Design a protein around this ligand. Structure first.
Ligand SMILES: [Zn+2]
Ligand SMILES: [Zn+2]
Lengths: 183, 969, 343
């Protein structure tokens, strides 16, 4: 009902539920896979935007406390900790606090493919171990991602204009100190 | 993209078929007898658009009535003595005066409806008394040919409580005066506590008269309140009572350490009567009379007889944006007034802000050339000076303190995207009912762009030019972070650099220097930027050591570096010598700065250059690196490597090596022409790492922008080419204790000096970083006149024979243009609300929209804004000068910036198809703004994913130069 | 290529940690009985650590495993070996940015940091004199401050072992303003976590039930058998927030005087009457104002039950005065001063 939708009457409707699971947390940690089953339930209701910082500053804090020792209950196995960490991230300012509970993730370089007016289409992820300068061509990178075109060399436009100026003999410019003088 | 994000806009109504009539009264040189107020209240109850105002002639007041379709009953709503003087329809044209009055008429009905929905008004704000309780302010503008639109500004304010019996009880026992918010206009008053009862005879009549104009609910009735030392009985329904990024600095600190109805009736004709089109914010001198005063402002601002100001100027709003914004002191004082009050405060502040060598300044502006590096508002005083007029007018009927705190500071005392849009959809029914008694909700950019009567797609991303092989390469700007992996090469042929480092004799700082520059050499050479080896003489890895202590830092600095810069071949036997066959390396002096002043360090460079032979001095550069980089915490190395390469500026050769070996010939003719006295010295050609790729006679476009420093003593200017090939900056001294016309003449000479060094016709587009003045427009119109630009074309022909034969080679000027950039501060777009990639997080986008912005519908200077265009950009803008955001400081922090670009001169086809030569002023802006976006992509830091800052590159360098002068001076 | 006939992040991170683990062992045992092998270790420790830092910024080796090894090296530091610790403190400052992005690592780091600070005290003024202990205290206090500021979800709590609050922890010198601002932010955030921890202490779950707790302990035996433990000789000898909780216990039985028991209802009056018996300045308050509100049905004297139950209260009121709990001299001087200002 909340996700498809008496402005704030449902907030207290859930803090009693928080008191329910606050009472029966000790029952939850007794089993092994039952730790996850009501761990995941509260995830989908938080991420939906049912509660934000402006609604109840303390409300958000209360669910976090429960979340720390559900994860601390994994260690006290470590592997079970990872077993659920991969199952928690597989779905995904308020997000800053949520991700702090999970472990540090692996980072990969991202390249932005333009694919042409000349707009941007997609983004590609490449591991940082494939980017080395020993190979002459680009193995992970493709030149067609950036819309590369090879064009023949030409003399610089600025250099040529200096040469063509020799036939003109216009007025001599100011010594660049004429501007920084009293009026 | 932002083509589906929600704005805060509402297409209120359509002006087709509208009709209006004007009724005028003349009086002597009680509200029931008055015909203007009796008719205004009577038509307001019937819910028809009505508005009244005063006229220049004393004792003259006029009432306007707007309606749609069928006429209302005019035999009853109009008093007997009132006589009409104007009967117009939409097909007969809508002047600006009518346009500004229609906006207030809509706001009159809108204000009435809002108070019926439990909204209380405090000045410009409408808030709900006790988050989804947010204050919203309405401003109007006419968008499109005939559609009338509004923009809602939503802000967070502290809670406000309606006055009740409980509040009064504690006031009587309180010795201190009780502070409360009064009126729809937010007056500041003290609650005396002498509450009234509705049964009283006085409040029977007082409330009865109040109900005629404002909708008052229906028990407490009224209360005595004292405002600004003047007491008055005021109804208790309208009274209100108020409620009354570090981790990095900290850890850096650590690293450093260890290593009454009559009164409110008059006010509504002065404070809220000003409801003008927001498109005409960028305006200047009145074209009709060549003055800064016009329209009906002669009655709102304290003779001369202006005649029929048809244009859209409004001096009331001119003083708002032209008080602290970057303007010439000569132009600003005209807007305010020297003889009147507040003229001395501006002069006193300017002098108090103030309270060396010429060649030092020239060195300073060379370092910023590279691509990589209170006052009470006048409009507020106007409201305070309006209190005295209204209160003294009101007090007469009954028979410094006021200017200080007449108005409650609640409106001056200060988010999320979901909650804001919740109120925006909440406000749609209110707007729907008010006009109807349809309206589109918060418009997306696509809907906003579609009804402008003119594509909502983002501007295309330009491609760059690089060198992969010995040939060129057209590459996307997103491939810059992989410069080393793809082994690309820049322009300028990899200039070679030999460096000297000055380091103190501290082991901790010495050891770090060797490793840092060893890493710098690797990244410099890994990129195809050339060779970064030190000076060929080997003295302990090319590091020179030194040894209050700045004096010790200078003696060895000058005594050592001054003079310093002033047959077996086993493997060679196999290969023969190639032959004699047919560019000295640049010298860079790296300076480490132990100090956490700097000029003390730059004083070496001033002393070294004078004691050096000319050929060595022509290529010598200085770089200063702080000592904290070596010790404490890489993207710094890539930025430093590219900055050093860009600053090289390889000099033009002084000899051709023809070896004529004969009396005379074509080779000698080039040589003797190369050494002519009129040829300038130190050409110093500029070659950047990359330039914009060309896009399909020959010409060029010069983009120049300028702004004054924090003091008006200096004019800072910068320039760039169409493709970013050239980039130069200038500083002009204007310090007189006429003062600006000479300064602008020097600037125009500098711009003329650049175009005349080429051999192809140019096009000039002039930009202004801030708001254009009212005198600068007059001065620029004289310099950039048709007669003038044509005259210098003929004067050029006389001097040069070569220009005489071929006109395609003479560096004449084909067109001129003046454009001013300033923020808007009225519209806001939230990227979070929608309707594969998420634009604001990982990409930069930019949309534009330009329209002719005519003053009315259906000699040298025409109307003030010729054409106007919005500049919506997701990418952040750099640190702008403080006066840039003075008008609308709230828009400074929003992520998608709104900027306004205006046209002022547009001199087309001087010599007699490019967009700059089209007489349609809308085509000129979309060409200038499109090139403004394209030049903004040259700011993409190779160490960074996207462009570091918004706008054109020339604007960005000018801003960097402004802060550099500000910080060190 | 040859192994084609595996995550590079995990394997290459393990090699560096194993290689760097050997360097620390060499340095530690050689300081206690300069040797040449230390210089060989020092050069390789200095360079390889700088190489690992660069690869960390490049994101080439796994962050979680590398950071986990760092804390394992910081928990093996011998007690009192500040020197060895000092050559490792800059590792914390360099990697302080990514420590606050996880709660597992911050909790491990805070418990290491809090315990170490307590050992050094047995305060800050004497330590700052020593050039050796000058950066350690500031380094340790700064890493603890930035943990809660950016990562509050990681804080029973590590702060339990620390006797001093982070609000008044020693701070680097220089700016008076900045230091005061950050101190205010730190103290308010510390209070935020202090109340959050209390809230979690009750697992997200007054005076009437207190007597019911004491009812069952007497009910374990027979009430007829007057045991030896009801007397205060055992209670007061082994002992001498109980005064504030016992004022309700005496009065609640007193108003419910329909139950009997008088000669066994004075032993608890002996407990708290001795604290105020030596008076012959402060005065016990809010006592008599409570009781006169609980007087029921004063308007109607037709019912005899409201009279005799109130008559029992006066007898309870008479006997409590002789126990000397409600003082009279400071009460009557207020009554003396009540009419003095009226005249
Ligand atoms: Zn010429
Ligand atoms: Zn005009």
């Amino acid at each position: 009902q909340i996700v498809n939708n008496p402005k704030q009457l449902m907030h207290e409707a859930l803090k009693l539920r928080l008191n329910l699971v606050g009472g029966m947390f000790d029952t939850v940690q007794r089993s092994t896979q039952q730790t996850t089953e009501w761990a995941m339930l509260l995830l989908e209701i938080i991420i939906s935007g049912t509660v934000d910082m402006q609604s109840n500053n303390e409300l958000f804090t209360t669910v976090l406390d429960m979340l720390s020792v559900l994860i601390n209950g994994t260690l006290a196995n470590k592997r079970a900790y990872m077993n659920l960490a991969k199952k928690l991230q597989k779905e995904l300012d308020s997000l800053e606090k949520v991700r702090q509970l999970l472990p540090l993730p692996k980072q990969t370089r991202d390249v932005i493919t333009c694919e042409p007016g000349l707009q941007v289409s997609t983004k590609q992820k490449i591991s940082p171990w494939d980017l080395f300068e020993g190979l002459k061509p680009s193995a992970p990178l493709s030149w067609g991602w950036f819309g590369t075109v090879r064009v023949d060399r030409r003399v610089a436009r600025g250099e040529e204009q200096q040469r063509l100026l020799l036939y003109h003999t216009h007025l001599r410019p100011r010594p660049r100190a004429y501007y920084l003088e009293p009026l | 993209s932002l083509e589906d994000c929600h704005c805060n806009l509402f297409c209120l109504a359509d002006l087709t078929g509208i009709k209006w009539k004007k009724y005028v009264w003349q009086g002597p040189t009680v509200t029931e007898e008055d015909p203007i107020l009796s008719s205004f209240s009577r038509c307001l109850k019937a819910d028809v658009l009505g508005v009244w105002r005063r006229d220049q002639r004393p004792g003259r007041r006029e009432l306007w009535i707007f309606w749609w379709g069928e006429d209302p009953s005019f035999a009853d709503l109009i008093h007997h003595d009132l006589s009409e003087e104007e009967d117009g329809v939409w097909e007969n044209g809508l002047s600006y005066e009518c346009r500004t009055l229609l906006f207030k008429a809509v706001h009159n009905l809108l204000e009435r409806c809002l108070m019926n929905r439990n909204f209380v008004r405090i000045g410009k704000w409408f808030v709900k008394p006790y988050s989804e309780h947010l204050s919203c302010s309405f401003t109007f503008f006419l968008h499109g040919d005939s559609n009338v639109c509004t923009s809602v500004e939503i802000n967070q304010h502290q809670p406000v409580y309606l006055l009740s019996e409980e509040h009064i009880t504690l006031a009587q026992q309180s010795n201190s005066p009780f502070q409360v918010i009064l009126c729809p206009f937010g007056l500041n008053g003290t609650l005396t506590g002498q509450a009234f009862k509705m049964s009283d005879s006085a409040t029977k009549k007082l409330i009865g008269e109040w109900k005629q104009f404002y909708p008052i609910s229906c028990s407490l009735a009224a209360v005595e309140v004292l405002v600004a030392g003047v007491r008055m009985i005021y109804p208790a329904c309208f009274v209100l009572v108020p409620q009354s990024q570090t981790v990095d600095p900290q850890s850096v600190q650590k690293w450093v350490k260890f290593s009454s109805l009559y009164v409110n009736l008059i006010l509504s004709e002065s404070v809220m009567n000003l409801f003008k089109d927001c498109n005409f914010d960028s305006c200047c001198i009145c074209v009709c009379n060549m003055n800064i005063k016009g329209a009906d402002v002669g009655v709102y601002i304290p003779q001369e007889a202006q005649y029929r100001c048809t244009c859209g100027f409004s001096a009331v709003m001119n003083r708002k944006f032209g008080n602290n914004s970057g303007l010439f002191l000569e132009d600003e004082l005209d807007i305010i007034g020297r003889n009147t009050d507040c003229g001395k405060e501006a002069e006193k502040r300017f002098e108090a802000l103030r309270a060396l060598s010429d060649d030092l300044i020239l060195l300073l502006q060379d370092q910023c050339t590279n691509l990589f590096s209170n006052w009470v508002r006048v409009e507020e005083r106007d409201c305070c000076n309006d209190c005295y007029l209204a209160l003294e007018h009101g007090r007469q009927f009954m028979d410094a303190l006021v200017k200080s705190s007449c108005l409650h500071p609640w409106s001056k005392r200060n988010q999320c995207s979901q909650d804001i849009l919740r109120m925006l959809l909440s406000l749609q029914p209110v707007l729907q009912d008010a006009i109807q008694k349809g309206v589109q909700g918060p418009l997306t950019w696509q809907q906003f762009h579609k009804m402008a009567g003119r594509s909502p797609e983002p501007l295309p991303i330009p491609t760059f030019l690089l060198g992969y092989d010995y040939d060129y390469l057209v590459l996307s700007p997103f491939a810059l972070p992989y410069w080393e992996r793809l082994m690309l090469e820049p322009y300028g042929s990899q200039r070679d650099i030999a460096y000297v480092v000055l380091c103190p004799e501290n082991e901790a700082l010495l050891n770090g220097a060797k490793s840092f520059f060893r890493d710098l050499t690797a990244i410099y050479e890994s990129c195809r930027l050339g060779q970064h080896r030190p000076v060929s003489r080997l003295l302990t890895d090319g590091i020179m050591r030194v040894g209050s202590k700045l004096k010790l830092y200078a003696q060895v600095c000058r005594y050592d570096l001054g003079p310093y810069l002033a047959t077996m071949d086993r493997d060679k036997v196999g290969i023969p010598t190639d032959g004699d066959s047919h560019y000295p390396p640049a010298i860079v002096v790296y300076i480490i700065d132990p100090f956490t002043w700097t000029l003390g360090l730059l004083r070496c460079f001033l002393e070294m250059v004078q004691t050096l032979p000319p050929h060595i001095k022509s290529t010598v550069s200085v770089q200063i690196i702080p000592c904290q980089y070596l010790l404490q915490p890489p993207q710094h190395l890539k930025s430093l490597a590219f900055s050093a390469f860009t600053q090289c500026r390889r000099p033009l050769p002084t000899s051709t090596n023809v070896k004529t070996l004969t009396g005379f010939g074509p080779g000698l003719a080039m040589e003797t022409a190369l050494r002519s006295p009129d040829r300038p010295e130190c050409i110093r050609l500029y070659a950047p790492p990359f330039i914009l790729a060309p896009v399909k006679q020959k010409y060029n476009v010069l983009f120049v922008g300028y702004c004054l420093s924090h003091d008006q003593r200096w004019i800072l200017a910068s320039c760039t080419d169409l493709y970013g090939e050239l980039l130069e900056t200038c500083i002009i001294n204007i310090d007189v204790p006429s003062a600006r016309k000479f300064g602008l003449q020097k600037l125009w000479e500098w711009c003329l000096g650049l175009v005349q060094m080429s051999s192809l016709p140019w096009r000039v587009v002039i930009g202004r970083l801030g708001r254009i003045g009212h005198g600068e427009l007059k001065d620029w119109s004289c310099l950039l006149s048709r007669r003038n630009l044509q005259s210098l074309s003929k004067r050029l022909k006389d001097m040069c024979r070569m220009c005489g034969i071929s006109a395609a080679d003479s560096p004449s000027i084909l067109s001129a243009c003046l454009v001013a950039m300033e923020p808007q501060g009225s519209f806001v777009i939230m990227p979070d609300s929608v309707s594969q990639l998420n634009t604001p997080q990982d990409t930069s986008c930019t949309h534009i929209l330009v329209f002719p912005t005519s003053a009315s519908v259906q000699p040298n200077i025409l109307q003030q804004p010729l054409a106007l265009g919005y500049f919506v950009s997701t990418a952040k803008a750099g640190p702008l000068p403080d006066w840039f955001w003075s008008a609308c400081p709230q828009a400074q922090y929003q992520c998608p910036l709104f900027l306004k670009a205006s046209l002022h001169l547009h001199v087309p086809s001087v010599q007699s198809s490019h967009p700059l030569d089209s007489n349609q002023t809308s085509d000129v802006l979309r060409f200038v703004l499109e090139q403004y976006n394209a030049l903004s992509w040259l700011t993409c830091d190779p160490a960074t994913q996207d462009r570091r800052s918004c706008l054109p590159i020339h604007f960005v360098v000018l801003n960097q130069l402004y802060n550099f002068i500000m910080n060190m001076l | 290529a040859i192994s084609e006939t595996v995550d590079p992040f995990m394997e290459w991170t393990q090699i560096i940690t194993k290689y760097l683990w050997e360097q620390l062992q060499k340095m530690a045992e050689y300081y206690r009985p300069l040797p040449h092998d230390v210089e060989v270790a020092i050069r390789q420790w200095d360079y390889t650590e700088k190489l690992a830092m660069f690869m960390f910024q490049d994101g080439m080796l796994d962050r979680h495993e590398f950071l986990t090894w760092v804390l394992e090296c910081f928990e093996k530091i011998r007690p009192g070996e500040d020197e060895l610790l000092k050559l490792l403190l800059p590792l914390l400052l360099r990697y302080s940015g990514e420590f606050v992005q996880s709660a597992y690592l911050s909790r491990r780091l805070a418990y290491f940091c809090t315990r170490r600070l307590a050992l050094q005290l047995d305060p800050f003024s004497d330590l700052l004199m020593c050039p050796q202990h000058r950066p350690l205290v500031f380094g340790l206090s700064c890493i603890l401050q930035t943990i809660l500021l950016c990562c509050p979800s990681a804080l029973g709590s590590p702060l339990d072992h620390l006797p001093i609050a982070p609000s008044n922890l020693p701070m680097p010198e220089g700016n008076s303003a900045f230091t005061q601002q950050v101190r205010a932010k730190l103290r308010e955030i510390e209070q935020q976590i202090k109340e959050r921890g209390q809230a979690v202490e009750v697992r997200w779950s007054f005076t009437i039930g207190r007597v019911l707790h004491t009812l069952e302990v007497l009910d374990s035996h027979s009430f007829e058998r007057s045991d030896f433990s009801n007397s205060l000789d055992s209670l007061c000898n082994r002992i001498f927030s109980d005064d504030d909780a016992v004022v309700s216990l005496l009065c609640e039985w007193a108003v419910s005087c329909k139950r009997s028991g008088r000669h066994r209802a004075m032993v608890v009056a002996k407990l708290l009457e001795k604290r105020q018996a030596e008076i012959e300045p402060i005065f016990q308050d809010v006592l008599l104002q409570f009781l006169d509100t609980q007087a029921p049905m004063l308007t109607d004297p037709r019912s005899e039950s409201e009279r005799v139950e109130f008559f029992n209260l006066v007898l309870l009121f008479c006997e409590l005065i002789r126990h000397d709990v409600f003082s009279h001299n400071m009460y009557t001087c207020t009554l003396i001063s009540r009419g003095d200002l009226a005249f």
